[PDB]
Design an enzyme around this catalytic site. Structure first.
Site, mmCIF file in Angstrom:
data_model
loop_
_atom_site.group_PDB
_atom_site.id
_atom_site.type_symbol
_atom_site.label_atom_id
_atom_site.label_comp_id
_atom_site.label_asym_id
_atom_site.label_seq_id
_atom_site.Cartn_x
_atom_site.Cartn_y
_atom_site.Cartn_z
ATOM 1 N N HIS A 62 37.512 69.447 13.384
ATOM 2 C CA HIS A 62 38.473 69.256 14.500
ATOM 3 C C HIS A 62 38.248 67.910 15.171
ATOM 4 O O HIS A 62 37.117 67.458 15.350
ATOM 5 C CB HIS A 62 38.279 70.399 15.500
ATOM 6 C CG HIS A 62 39.051 70.284 16.792
ATOM 7 N ND1 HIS A 62 40.438 70.194 16.847
ATOM 8 C CD2 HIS A 62 38.645 70.321 18.089
ATOM 9 C CE1 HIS A 62 40.826 70.171 18.111
ATOM 10 N NE2 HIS A 62 39.764 70.276 18.893
ATOM 11 N N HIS A 109 38.668 66.394 18.428
ATOM 12 C CA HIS A 109 38.762 66.999 19.746
ATOM 13 C C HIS A 109 39.516 66.142 20.736
ATOM 14 O O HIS A 109 39.103 65.000 21.039
ATOM 15 C CB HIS A 109 37.349 67.291 20.283
ATOM 16 C CG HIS A 109 37.349 67.884 21.652
ATOM 17 N ND1 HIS A 109 36.870 69.161 21.890
ATOM 18 C CD2 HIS A 109 37.799 67.373 22.817
ATOM 19 C CE1 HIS A 109 37.033 69.395 23.190
ATOM 20 N NE2 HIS A 109 37.619 68.358 23.751
ATOM 21 N N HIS A 138 34.020 67.324 15.333
ATOM 22 C CA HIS A 138 32.991 68.317 15.097
ATOM 23 C C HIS A 138 33.447 69.365 14.112
ATOM 24 O O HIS A 138 34.646 69.661 14.031
ATOM 25 C CB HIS A 138 32.483 68.945 16.417
ATOM 26 C CG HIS A 138 33.531 69.617 17.274
ATOM 27 N ND1 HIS A 138 33.973 70.898 17.055
ATOM 28 C CD2 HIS A 138 34.195 69.194 18.398
ATOM 29 C CE1 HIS A 138 34.825 71.236 18.027
ATOM 30 N NE2 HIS A 138 35.007 70.210 18.847
ATOM 31 N N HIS A 174 34.496 72.935 13.082
ATOM 32 C CA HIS A 174 35.170 74.005 13.792
ATOM 33 C C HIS A 174 35.200 75.256 12.907
ATOM 34 O O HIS A 174 36.182 76.008 12.909
ATOM 35 C CB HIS A 174 36.580 73.565 14.281
ATOM 36 C CG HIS A 174 37.008 74.228 15.557
ATOM 37 N ND1 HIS A 174 36.967 75.591 15.768
ATOM 38 C CD2 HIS A 174 37.508 73.697 16.705
ATOM 39 C CE1 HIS A 174 37.371 75.839 17.027
ATOM 40 N NE2 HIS A 174 37.717 74.702 17.631
ATOM 41 N N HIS A 213 31.538 78.329 32.394
ATOM 42 C CA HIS A 213 32.186 78.208 31.092
ATOM 43 C C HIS A 213 33.145 77.030 31.085
ATOM 44 O O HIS A 213 34.102 76.983 31.882
ATOM 45 C CB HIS A 213 32.971 79.490 30.772
ATOM 46 C CG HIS A 213 32.148 80.736 30.761
ATOM 47 N ND1 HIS A 213 31.290 81.026 29.714
ATOM 48 C CD2 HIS A 213 32.035 81.753 31.686
ATOM 49 C CE1 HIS A 213 30.662 82.163 30.040
ATOM 50 N NE2 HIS A 213 31.098 82.617 31.197
ATOM 51 N N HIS A 246 38.558 74.938 27.032
ATOM 52 C CA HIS A 246 39.237 73.828 26.322
ATOM 53 C C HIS A 246 40.481 74.355 25.644
ATOM 54 O O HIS A 246 40.492 75.441 25.048
ATOM 55 C CB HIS A 246 38.277 73.222 25.297
ATOM 56 C CG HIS A 246 38.933 72.281 24.320
ATOM 57 N ND1 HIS A 246 39.609 71.134 24.696
ATOM 58 C CD2 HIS A 246 39.001 72.317 22.967
ATOM 59 C CE1 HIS A 246 40.045 70.514 23.607
ATOM 60 N NE2 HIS A 246 39.684 71.210 22.529
ATOM 61 N N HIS A 273 43.417 73.210 22.799
ATOM 62 C CA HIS A 273 43.847 72.303 21.746
ATOM 63 C C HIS A 273 45.305 71.891 21.989
ATOM 64 O O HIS A 273 46.072 72.556 22.683
ATOM 65 C CB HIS A 273 43.739 72.999 20.362
ATOM 66 C CG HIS A 273 42.354 73.293 19.878
ATOM 67 N ND1 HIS A 273 42.047 73.135 18.543
ATOM 68 C CD2 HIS A 273 41.230 73.743 20.475
ATOM 69 C CE1 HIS A 273 40.784 73.505 18.350
ATOM 70 N NE2 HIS A 273 40.253 73.884 19.499
ATOM 71 N N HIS A 277 39.693 78.266 24.310
ATOM 72 C CA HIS A 277 38.403 78.944 24.203
ATOM 73 C C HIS A 277 37.374 78.276 25.077
ATOM 74 O O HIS A 277 37.493 77.102 25.435
ATOM 75 C CB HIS A 277 37.945 79.009 22.751
ATOM 76 C CG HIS A 277 37.720 77.672 22.108
ATOM 77 N ND1 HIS A 277 36.518 76.980 22.192
ATOM 78 C CD2 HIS A 277 38.504 76.925 21.281
ATOM 79 C CE1 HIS A 277 36.612 75.840 21.505
ATOM 80 N NE2 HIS A 277 37.825 75.771 20.940
ATOM 81 N N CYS A 278 36.307 79.016 25.386
ATOM 82 C CA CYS A 278 35.101 78.414 25.947
ATOM 83 C C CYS A 278 34.470 77.505 24.908
ATOM 84 O O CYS A 278 34.349 77.873 23.733
ATOM 85 C CB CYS A 278 34.086 79.509 26.342
ATOM 86 S SG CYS A 278 32.661 78.736 27.123
ATOM 87 N N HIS A 279 34.086 76.297 25.341
ATOM 88 C CA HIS A 279 33.480 75.333 24.419
ATOM 89 C C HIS A 279 31.966 75.446 24.327
ATOM 90 O O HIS A 279 31.286 74.600 23.677
ATOM 91 C CB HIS A 279 33.909 73.873 24.724
ATOM 92 C CG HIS A 279 34.086 73.015 23.479
ATOM 93 N ND1 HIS A 279 33.058 72.720 22.613
ATOM 94 C CD2 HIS A 279 35.172 72.395 22.960
ATOM 95 C CE1 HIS A 279 33.509 71.942 21.630
ATOM 96 N NE2 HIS A 279 34.791 71.701 21.817
ATOM 97 N N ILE A 280 31.344 76.468 24.937
ATOM 98 C CA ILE A 280 29.953 76.850 24.565
ATOM 99 C C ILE A 280 30.112 77.596 23.217
ATOM 100 O O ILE A 280 30.749 78.680 23.133
ATOM 101 C CB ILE A 280 29.334 77.722 25.651
ATOM 102 C CG1 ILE A 280 29.157 76.931 26.958
ATOM 103 C CG2 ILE A 280 27.998 78.287 25.178
ATOM 104 C CD1 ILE A 280 28.795 77.704 28.203
ATOM 105 N N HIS A 282 29.508 81.167 22.668
ATOM 106 C CA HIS A 282 30.475 82.054 23.313
ATOM 107 C C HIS A 282 31.743 82.223 22.501
ATOM 108 O O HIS A 282 32.295 83.315 22.423
ATOM 109 C CB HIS A 282 30.756 81.592 24.751
ATOM 110 C CG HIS A 282 29.569 81.599 25.649
ATOM 111 N ND1 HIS A 282 29.653 81.158 26.953
ATOM 112 C CD2 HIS A 282 28.286 81.981 25.424
ATOM 113 C CE1 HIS A 282 28.454 81.279 27.499
ATOM 114 N NE2 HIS A 282 27.620 81.805 26.611
ATOM 115 N N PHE A 287 35.050 84.525 22.758
ATOM 116 C CA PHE A 287 35.673 84.072 24.036
ATOM 117 C C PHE A 287 36.817 83.075 23.732
ATOM 118 O O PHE A 287 36.718 81.862 24.016
ATOM 119 C CB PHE A 287 34.604 83.457 24.950
ATOM 120 C CG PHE A 287 34.812 83.602 26.443
ATOM 121 C CD1 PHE A 287 35.720 84.481 27.004
ATOM 122 C CD2 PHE A 287 33.980 82.917 27.304
ATOM 123 C CE1 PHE A 287 35.786 84.697 28.364
ATOM 124 C CE2 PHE A 287 34.064 83.107 28.687
ATOM 125 C CZ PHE A 287 34.964 83.985 29.217
HETATM 126 CU CU CU Z 1 31.263 80.280 27.819
HETATM 127 CU CU CU Z 2 35.763 70.245 20.707
HETATM 128 CU CU CU Z 3 39.793 70.687 20.732
HETATM 129 CU CU CU Z 4 38.471 74.717 19.475
#
Ligand code: CU
Ligand code: CU
Ligand code: CU
Ligand code: CU
Ligand SMILES: *[C@@H]1O[C@H](CO)[C@@H](O[C@@H]2O[C@H](CO)[C@@H](O)[C@H](O)[C@H]2NC(C)=O)[C@H](O)[C@H]1NC(C)=O
Ligand SMILES: *[C@@H]1O[C@H](CO)[C@@H](O[C@@H]2O[C@H](CO)[C@@H](O)[C@H](O)[C@H]2NC(C)=O)[C@H](O)[C@H]1NC(C)=O
Ligand code: NA
Length: 499
Positions: free
Chosen positions: A65, A67, A110, A112, A397, A400, A402, A452-455, A458, A463
């Site tokens: 991905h 980002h 990164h 994905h 949290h 993010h 897309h 989604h949460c980007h941790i 998670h 999440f």
């Molecule tokens: Cu999270």
């Molecule tokens: Cu990302």
């Molecule tokens: Cu993204």
């Molecule tokens: Cu994503």
């Protein structure tokens, strides 16, 4: 050197020791972080990703991905596994061929797939602006002015229990740093500046989890970009940066020639700076080659506060100036229990058929889409509001979206919304108990967009939800190349999956 906008990128396994401890990794371009991919605004990027992975302990499939890049008309190139594509299998390659109209700033790339980016597949992605409105504020902006912040783990990601509080073993600044336990005096990164010059430092969180308190002893930092969005100048002495966020700041090399600590304190893992953990070195040309002797203050008098940020351009806010004042106002129920996250009562588990391929095959409402309850349709050409009230365990949290950036109508730790001039960004901390962080955007980009949460731990624990934006126009807006159509047959054959 930077690579791109047209380049090959090989994904391999190798041993690395960025904190003195050797472990195998998943790498782009043979390094951690991966090489910087760069071009100019509006360029055609064609990143031909060669999957050369052979170690099953970090997964031999991959997907990448880009980002923060909107992928308008190229949803198939966005990268999230089982949302926009099936993974690339080992020994195969895939050309991510897209354009970046109307965007310029600091991004990253990164894996994905699962938690694979934690195992090392992460690097910077910079879209320069030949007519940058901020160009006169600095002298130097190049690969030497990118600063990455990363969490690093001694345990391999596929050995991290799902839904657990997973804690790192080192903070890495530009790929180097020291381990929190069994600390050894391994090499620290050096960022070199010339007395009197001004630098556009591009600060990138490539974290899988922690947020960092980032500062530079003796120096302050003038923010001019937030997640790709040009800002008014805001001078701060500390930046709390959450996973996947980016800032550009002007660093004025206006202190005495010398060595100064660069500090990045994570919210979990090792606290403080003993033995040179959580540290790098700012060195002025002509300084002695030795560690800094500088001190942090006990408290930082001008920390970044997100409501202080405002766009350089007159971006405004879409919709009407009150809660619910949008065409499609949503409130997500964000929860955690028993090792799994949920959104609106449903924990995300990736489907067998990528969401985009389900839509291209004719499924055309969100209740026809899998996973059931994990896909929300959005209407076209409409103002969307999404309230993200915090409280779920494991915070704060960083959510993010897309395909989009968004106005941050309400930020963490402040109950007052801003319908006039808030910053726009792509990843936002939703804060703490009782907060009501809220985002707005307009739907002008047909396709399925992950939220989604980007941790990354998670996300793995569920999440996430998918916004199926303008389902009726997804197929006409996003013509797909044959190589994309070939990915799911190849993946499912290799894995003995029937679909
Ligand atoms: Cu999270
Ligand atoms: Cu990302
Ligand atoms: Cu993204
Ligand atoms: Cu994503
Ligand atoms: C966050 O703000 C949203 C609105 O953006 C609030 O949503 C309302 O929730 C109440 C019940 O709690 C409903 O009666 C309304 O239909 C919702 N929409 C409105 C008023 O526009 C939500 O309650 C807020 N959450 C927190 C924790 O403050
Ligand atoms: C809490 O957030 C609000 C809204 O973003 C901030 O209020 C603004 O404050 C600025 C700076 O003084 C004023 O110019 C704006 O008119 C305010 N807007 C509104 C809608 O009130 C507020 O400053 C933030 N609180 C803290 C402590 O930073
Ligand atoms: Na407006």
């Amino acid at each position: 050197a930077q690579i791109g906008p047209v380049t090959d990128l090989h994904i391999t396994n190798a041993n690395i020791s960025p904190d003195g401890f050797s472990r195998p990794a998943v790498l782009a371009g043979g390094t951690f972080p991966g090489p910087t991919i760069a071009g100019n605004t509006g360029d055609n990027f064609q990143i031909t990703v060669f999957n050369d992975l052979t170690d099953p302990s970090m997964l031999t499939d991959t997907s990448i991905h880009w980002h923060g890049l909107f992928q308008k008309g190229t949803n198939w190139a966005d990268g999230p596994a089982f949302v926009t594509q099936c993974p690339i299998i080992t020994g195969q390659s895939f050309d991510y061929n897209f354009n970046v109209p109307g965007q310029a700033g600091t991004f990253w790339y990164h894996s994905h797939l699962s938690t694979q980016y934690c195992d090392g597949l992460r690097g910077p992605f910079v879209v320069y602006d030949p007519n940058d409105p901020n160009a006169s504020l600095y002298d130097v902006d190049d690969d030497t002015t990118i600063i990455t912040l990363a969490d690093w783990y001694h345990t391999l990601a596929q050995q991290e229990p799902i839904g657990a509080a997973i804690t790192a073993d080192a903070t890495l600044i530009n790929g180097l740093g020291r381990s929190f336990t069994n600390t050894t005096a391994s090499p620290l990164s050096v960022i070199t500046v010339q007395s009197g010059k001004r630098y556009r430092m591009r600060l990138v969180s490539i974290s899988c989890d922690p947020n960092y308190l980032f500062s530079i002893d003796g120096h302050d930092m003038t923010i001019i970009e937030v997640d790709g969005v040009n800002s008014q100048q805001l001078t701060v002495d500390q930046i709390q940066i959450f996973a996947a966020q980016r800032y550009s700041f002007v660093l004025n090399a206006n202190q005495p020639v010398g060595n100064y600590w660069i500090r990045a304190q994570p919210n979990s893992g090792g606290q403080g700076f003993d033995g040179g953990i959580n540290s790098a070195i700012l060195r002025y040309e002509g300084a002695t080659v030795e560690d800094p002797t500088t001190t942090a203050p006990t408290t930082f008098s001008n920390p970044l506060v997100e409501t202080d940020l405002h766009p350089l351009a007159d971006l405004g806010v879409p919709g009407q100036p009150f809660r619910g004042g949008a065409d499609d106002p949503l409130v997500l129920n964000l929860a955690f229990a028993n090792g799994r996250f949920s959104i609106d009562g449903v924990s995300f588990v990736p489907p067998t058929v990528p969401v985009l391929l389900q839509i291209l095959s004719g499924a055309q409402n969100a209740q026809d889409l899998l996973p059931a309850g994990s896909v929300i349709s959005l209407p076209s050409n409409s103002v969307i509001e999404v309230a993200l009230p915090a409280g779920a365990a494991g915070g704060p949290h960083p959510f993010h979206l897309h395909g989009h950036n968004f106005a941050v109508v309400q930020s963490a730790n402040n109950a007052t919304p801003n319908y006039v001039n808030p910053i726009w960004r792509d990843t936002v901390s939703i804060g703490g108990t009782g907060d009501n962080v809220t985002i707005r955007f307009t739907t002008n980009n047909p396709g399925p967009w992950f939220l989604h949460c980007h941790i990354d731990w998670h996300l793995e624990a569920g999440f996430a939800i998918v916004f199926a934006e303008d389902i009726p126009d997804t197929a006409s807006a996003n013509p797909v190349p044959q190589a994309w159509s070939d990915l799911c047959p190849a993946y499912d054959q290799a894995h003995n999956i029937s679909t």
